[PDB]
Design a protein around this ligand. Sequence first.
Ligand SMILES: [Cl-]
Ligand SMILES: [Cl-]
Ligand SMILES: [Cl-]
Ligand SMILES: [Cl-]
Ligand SMILES: [Cl-]
Ligand SMILES: [Cl-]
Ligand SMILES: [Cl-]
Ligand SMILES: [Cl-]
Ligand SMILES: [Cl-]
Ligand SMILES: [Cl-]
Ligand SMILES: [Cl-]
Ligand SMILES: [Cl-]
Ligand SMILES: [Cl-]
Ligand SMILES: [Cl-]
Ligand SMILES: [Cl-]
Ligand SMILES: [Cl-]
Ligand SMILES: [Cl-]
Ligand SMILES: [Cl-]
Ligand SMILES: [Cl-]
Ligand SMILES: [Cl-]
Lengths: 110, 110
Amino acid sequence: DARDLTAFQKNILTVLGEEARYGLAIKRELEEYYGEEVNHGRLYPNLDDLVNKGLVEKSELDKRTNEYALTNEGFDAVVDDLEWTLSKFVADADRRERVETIVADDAAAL
Amino acid sequence: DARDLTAFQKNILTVLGEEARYGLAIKRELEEYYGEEVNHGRLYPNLDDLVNKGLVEKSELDKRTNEYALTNEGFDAVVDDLEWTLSKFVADADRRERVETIVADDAAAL
Ligand SMILES: [Cl-]
Ligand SMILES: [Cl-]
Ligand SMILES: [Cl-]
Ligand SMILES: [Cl-]
Ligand SMILES: [Cl-]
Ligand SMILES: [Cl-]
Ligand SMILES: [Cl-]
Ligand SMILES: [Cl-]
Ligand SMILES: [Cl-]
Ligand SMILES: [Cl-]
Ligand SMILES: [Cl-]
Ligand SMILES: [Cl-]
Ligand SMILES: [Cl-]
Ligand SMILES: [Cl-]
Ligand SMILES: [Cl-]
Ligand SMILES: [Cl-]
Ligand SMILES: [Cl-]
Ligand SMILES: [Cl-]
Ligand SMILES: [Cl-]
Ligand SMILES: [Cl-]
């Protein structure tokens, strides 16, 4: 089950929900989120874990470079947690309008 | 600091984003999420941590019942996580359509 993942592992999945990324690209995406450095020794063992759990697939481009992508299971985990989060956040009309605005503005910036 | 919370602590904040709740009520909402029992020894020390961080307020009610609610800081942390999650998930028009359906269905069920 994916609901037991650590916050750091879920954030990797969130990053890859946007698009498949090289390991180094995931690291900088996480660093922009956390506002502090993400060590190589924290990211890559957790990438390994998610690959072994069946949530991420690894494509070997070169020695010292790989691309990571969500599996179907991984995407299901991302959508499952988003649904649960929204089921609790969308608690009244004001909350509905707030999310509608977030999504619309996110779309506009694409 | 809020972006450094554990998955369990973030899930507590999510639960209280829906509405204020007694400790016992938080426990069962989390149990429904995880599909497994949540021990008192895990929930309550984490609630105390969130209170100490200023993200939850503990209202001590009559006769040994406590009710927990988000502070303004706690609500900020829930929205900030949701915005980051949505910024990564809403990557194209089909992703936007899926989120908008989830939000609308949730609102309709209220
Ligand atoms: Cl965690
Ligand atoms: Cl973590
Ligand atoms: Cl990349
Ligand atoms: Cl890599
Ligand atoms: Cl790169
Ligand atoms: Cl780190
Ligand atoms: Cl490594
Ligand atoms: Cl989520
Ligand atoms: Cl759900
Ligand atoms: Cl509504
Ligand atoms: Cl709101
Ligand atoms: Cl956790
Ligand atoms: Cl979480
Ligand atoms: Cl309650
Ligand atoms: Cl209890
Ligand atoms: Cl109760
Ligand atoms: Cl804090
Ligand atoms: Cl308090
Ligand atoms: Cl964001
Ligand atoms: Cl989609």
